[PDB]
């Protein structure tokens, strides 16, 4: 009785939200950006190849200096690379080799990682002893750790396969805020440039926008047909792009609270693993299961170029803060740095 | 053409690669086994005989084994099963005594049939096309006791065989191996274990060694 009545009210609210989004869908992003010229063909060459990982690379993250980057592989090794020289700065042996994510702190003093062990381990890079040591192990998730991102040296946000995201206090080792509401495994998260909001994509084919300080879900974005594997904020923080197993990328707007554009091709039938934007946000780079990375025109939904330099899945990619280069990691155990030439 | 500290940084990188090469050689000589099965199916008993993922290390006749238990994860299996692509073999545990039981959660699904659908997905999985399976049929002593009271007809309606233990045990093994839709790429090794058995480790070593040799014969091109 009461349960049946309440679940009918939820459907009425969903129809109200759907009507509200349709009301403000006066135009399409495609129509707005039809007049602007295309970016042309984007040609990028492999400037560097980072060798030394002996297993599938699952994650990488640039440091804020646009020169150092950390990559994670399931050979149980966290490696920090000097991208200019390809020198290995550190090699961090992981207690659990099943790592799925890695993060570089914006200060550059810490790195984080975690996987099937349900733990987010924090590593201190600047010690008087001259070696990298574990500074914190964040326990509390009951599923695998899928993504982690530092807010500062003391705060980090982690998403897990137990359908929840958490905000952690690194010094005390306790999760200050727990973000619940996803009905599937949360696979990725992206922090807003001001680090006051973050979006997460789960296996319920939905993306939720979370308030870090308040700790509740502000908006929910649907439209994908399969699990979302990747998510990335637009450089101004007013939009984000997702990548799913249905071979599509969608651009959602926070303020319009709805999908604006779909990035898919008929030849593409494989899942998407990673997404990122160029510094100006005009280019959307996505890694695919078909061993390639496709560069999309974010405004016009045109495939600008292809990064074909891997013999297995492109599992991760990232663009430097200065926008100079893009790194792609892959299951073939190699990392490559790409940029164009005049 | 490098500076004084640059030449020292390159030397540091070369030493890291030397240590990474050594760790890769050590890790490539270890046998990695993915342990699967259903809850309360004897899997815990197997580990003794030998909140995320539980790893067990043991050595048997100058061979190091890594056994990965992923039964404690309730997340989506398809989101992390590809991480084990490349293990030497999969150790699958099936409880024979659970043929007449009913799954506790579903309350209307046969427990034995729940293992078949789990086995069918793992055996036919795209990430384990070339990975052999070591099928352990646990609780054989309790299975014999249940045979006298509850016949096999409850589990298999289309079972015209005798109600003897040997005939009943062999029929269950055939059904599991018939779920293998690729009988050429992979092989299924079936062993009847028990709580008091002590030769389970030996069968794993024999099956793992058989997998390793047949992997070399594919590298050499003679097979």
């Amino acid at each position: 009785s009461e349960l049946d009545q309440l679940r009918q009210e939820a459907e009425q609210l969903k129809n109200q939200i759907r009507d509200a989004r349709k009301a403000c869908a006066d135009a399409t992003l495609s129509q707005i950006t039809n007049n602007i010229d295309p970016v042309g063909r984007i040609q990028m060459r492999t400037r560097r190849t980072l060798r030394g990982h002996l297993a599938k690379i699952y994650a990488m993250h640039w440091g804020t200096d646009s020169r150092l980057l950390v990559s994670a592989s399931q050979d149980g090794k966290l490696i920090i690379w000097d991208s200019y020289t390809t020198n290995k700065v550190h090699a961090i042996p992981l207690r659990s080799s099943w790592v799925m994510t890695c993060a570089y702190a914006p200060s550059g003093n810490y790195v984080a990682c975690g996987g099937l062990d349900n733990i987010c381990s924090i590593y201190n890079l600047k010690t008087r002893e001259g070696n990298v040591r574990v500074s914190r192990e964040l326990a509390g998730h009951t599923g695998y750790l899928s993504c982690c991102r530092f807010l500062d040296d003391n705060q980090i946000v982690t998403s897990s396969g137990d359908t929840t995201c958490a905000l952690w206090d690194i010094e005390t080792g306790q999760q200050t805020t727990t973000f619940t509401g996803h009905t599937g495994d949360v696979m990725s998260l992206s922090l807003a440039p001001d680090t006051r909001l973050f979006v997460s994509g789960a296996c319920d084919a939905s993306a939720k926008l979370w308030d870090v300080r308040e700790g509740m879900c502000r908006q929910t974005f649907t439209g994908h047909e399969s699990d979302i594997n990747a998510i990335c904020f637009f450089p101004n923080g007013n939009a984000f792009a997702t990548g799913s197993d249905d071979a599509t990328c969608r651009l959602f707007d926070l303020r319009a609270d709805q999908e604006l554009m779909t990035y898919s091709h008929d030849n593409i039938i494989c899942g998407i693993t990673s997404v990122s934007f160029s510094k100006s946000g005009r280019l959307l780079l996505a890694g695919y299961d078909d061993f390639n990375c496709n560069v999309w025109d974010a405004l016009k939904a045109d495939r600008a170029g292809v990064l074909a330099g891997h013999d297995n899945r492109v599992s991760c990619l990232g663009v430097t803060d200065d926008g100079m280069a893009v790194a792609t990691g892959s299951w073939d155990s190699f990392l490559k740095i790409w940029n164009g030439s005049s | 053409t490098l500076s004084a500290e640059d030449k020292a940084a390159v030397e540091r990188s070369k030493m890291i690669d030397r240590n990474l090469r050594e760790d890769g050689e050590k890790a490539a000589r270890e046998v990695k086994l993915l342990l699967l099965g259903a809850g309360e199916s004897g899997k815990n008993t197997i580990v003794k005989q030998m909140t995320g993922i539980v790893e067990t290390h043991f050595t048997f006749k100058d061979l190091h084994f890594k056994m990965f238990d992923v039964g404690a994860q309730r997340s989506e299996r398809k989101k992390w099963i590809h991480c084990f692509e490349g293990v030497t073999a999969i150790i699958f545990c099936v409880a024979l005594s659970d043929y007449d039981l009913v799954l506790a959660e579903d309350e209307e699904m046969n427990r034995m049939h729940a293992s078949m659908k789990l086995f069918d997905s793992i055996c036919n999985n795209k990430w384990f096309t070339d990975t052999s399976i070591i099928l352990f049929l646990n609780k054989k002593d309790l299975f014999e006791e249940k045979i006298k009271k509850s016949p096999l007809t409850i589990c298999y309606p289309e079972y015209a065989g005798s109600n003897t233990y040997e005939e009943a045990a062999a029929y269950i093994q055939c059904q599991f191996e018939d779920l293998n839709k690729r009988k050429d790429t992979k092989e299924i090794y079936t062993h009847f274990t028990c709580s008091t058995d002590t030769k389970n480790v030996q069968f794993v070593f024999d099956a793992v060694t058989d997998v390793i040799i047949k992997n070399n014969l594919k590298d050499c091109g003679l097979f």
Partner: single-chain antibody
Amino acid sequence: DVQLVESGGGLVQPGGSRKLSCSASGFAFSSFGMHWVRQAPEKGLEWVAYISSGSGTIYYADTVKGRFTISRDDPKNTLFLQMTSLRSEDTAMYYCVRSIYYYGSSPFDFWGQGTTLTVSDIVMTQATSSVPVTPGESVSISCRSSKSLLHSNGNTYLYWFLQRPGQSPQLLIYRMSNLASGVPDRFSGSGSGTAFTLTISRLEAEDVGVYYCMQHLEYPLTFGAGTKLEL
């Protein structure tokens, strides 16, 4: 805590042999390159030898090459300096210095207390030998080099050290601008090409001492004469 204790020094006859030891505790010794630096009584610092991490690269100063042998024992965390044919010119306090080299590292960050031995090339210039100072006043120290210390990679390999009376040298500024860990922010390093300045805002009593500028562009590493601050 990070410690470097030297032993084996003492009075030796000319032409003799002596073995200096440097025991390391509190840090990953095998990961650090090691230098020996000596300081003649009432004189400046002089680099002696260098052994890299992994013992693959070894360098010597010209004045000691062929007579001194530097070695390390990574499992024992001990650094050695085998000396032969000791001359009266070798009478100095020998310091054990750790230095690690990677992108963004701070070489020469920790110095040992030193051991005393008594026997019976880019030129770095610090023309100002002494500077009278008063507490709370800003002081600038100048250093010059015969060659440009700016490399094509953008680094300027100039280091600043402070040797307080009775204490071992301490790193202040590495690569001409970066401030070493544990050093107050009042110290600032500024330079260009061959001319460098160390600015000390709001001088305090602890800052009193001798300041040395060292170049790390190439071997042999050379030190400046040193500028003394006195009240």
